[PDB]
């Protein structure tokens with residue numbers, strides 16, 4: 001089983017126990033957005049990221065305890081409609097908020113049990129991308145096209161297709177990258193670099209990222225969900241804080257921003273679309289949704305070719 005999280009007295013992770021880290025419940029987020037949790041019946045705001053004033057204009061102390069009806073009157077009824085108690089876990093509510101003075105905010109909401117999890121962050125290609133992946137006549141061509149298409153759409157410095165072997169080691173089997181960058185084609189890596197509980201999570205929650213590999217995580221306050229006195233499920237929150245071990249791996253590779261999308265075949269994790277940028281980089285929200293879609297399409301095409 002998982003260790004308890006650090007804030008419940010669990011051990012800190014080392015190379016002896018990579019696979020025990022409860023990466024889905026870090027109690028913290030990345031600083032490029034804000035996260036609120038709210039009761040899924042009353043809309044009471046229960047937990048607030050400590051940075052929330054940066055995005056929402058009000059201090060966490062002020063936000064906590066208010067209802068979504070009071071805070072987001074234009075969205076609460078639509079949210080009640082879209083994400084009722086007992087709804088399918090994969091459902092999402094999305095809106096664009098135009099009231100911030102210096103931009104627009106993307107709001108993304110999902111339900112986990114009795115909690116709503118609200119994420120706020122600033123905010124023919126599709127036909128062509130779909131066609132390119134569906135048409136590729138063999139797995140090599142498919143991998144080449146997928147990496148090139150994801151790079152073109154996203155702008156990432158490096159986009160790889162990373163395939164797991166039967167011993168859970170991985171290999172870069174295709175790549176698209178910025179002019180002059182060193183090729184990572186053919187490089188192979190130990191199984192511990194993507195440990196077993198990460199691979200399991202990635203069979204369920206198909207995209208994750210680290211937008212700035214040097215940025216400190218921002219706690220949720222309070223850290224435990226008051227409904228349960230237990231950790232808040234964040235596996236489905238893009239803004240979730242990344243494992244420290246993995247962020248250090250990335251820094252030591254010269255990666256400022258990382259993002260991957262699962263390739264799932266027969267319900268197993270076949271591989272990953274792995275994206276790197278040398279500097280920090282916040283892939284825009286709409287482009288994340290596009291990459292998720294392309295991951296699903298790639299997954300089915302890989303299943304077919306095999």
Ligand SMILES: *C/C=C1/C(=C/c2[nH]c(/C=C3[NH+]=C(/C=C4\NC(=O)C(C=C)=C4C)C(C)=C\3CCC(=O)O)c(CCC(=O)O)c2C)NC(=O)[C@H]1C
Nearest residue numbers: 014015018023189192193194198242243245246258259260
């Ligand atoms: C003892 C623990 C270790 C550790 C843990 C760890 N790693 C991940 C997630 C990823 N690891 C990845 C590995 C690579 N990315 C690359 O570009 C290459 C090679 C060129 C490799 C081998 C990748 C792709 C991920 C997924 C996340 C991402 O795309 O950025 C986790 C889970 C992170 C999280 O979701 O919070 C964990 C716990 N890695 C180790 O090397 C050891 C020290």
Ligand code: NA
Nearest residue numbers: 024233234235
């Ligand atoms: Na979770």
